[PDB]
Amino acid sequence: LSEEQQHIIAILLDAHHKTYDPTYADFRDFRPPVRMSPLSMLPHLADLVSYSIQKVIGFAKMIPGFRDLTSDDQIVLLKSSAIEVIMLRSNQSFTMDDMSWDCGSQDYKYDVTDVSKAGHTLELIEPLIKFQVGLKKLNLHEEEHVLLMAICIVSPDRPGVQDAKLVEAIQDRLSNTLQTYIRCRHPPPGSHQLYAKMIQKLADLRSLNEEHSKQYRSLSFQPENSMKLTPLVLEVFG
């Protein structure tokens, strides 16, 4: 594990620490949850998605190499990964006990019914929950977790990328750092084909992204529901 690689991990950890509040105190600022009137959860969860986008931006800005990229690339990458990083980062609150995201209290505890009350069908939700279960099972070190989130964001593969070779070279430094960290600082059996399983999660996310996009197009089809979102959410997903 090189010194440049040690440094890269320390940065991502702190970057994550600074963008992910495990007490979820800001949640009081959101429009309230309503669990009774379909789409009752749309205003609370939109606010949460919106907040989460900002925190992913703040995280992304600190990825070593991310600043060297052009503004338009920066745009393209955040736009297309946002929902994925939110799915990934939400794994920290996801609990297998009852297949729910537990953000510190019952008010901020989300389940299938809740995500449903925000206009989403099982075509998304069921594989989203399966995704969370298989990610939780990997039992990642926080270091692998923050590297995965960074690799997801810096993908040369995203449509509309100008400098695909630069994005790739940056992704590579992170891949290598993650490949090397698994070998070093994950003990077996936890480290068995662990990189391959991580990269696979990355493919599941694309699939989840596609589904979210289509269910987003359909939801934001009625201007009545589209007006329940936030400006950042309209700009990023819009």
């Binding site: 800005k61 920066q74 736009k79 400006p231 700009e235 990023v236």
Partner: peptide, 10 residues
């Protein structure tokens, strides 16, 4: 076309 995303990145 994304002024809010830009301001957050700057």
């Amino acid at each position: 076309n994304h002024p809010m995303l830009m301001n957050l990145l700057k």
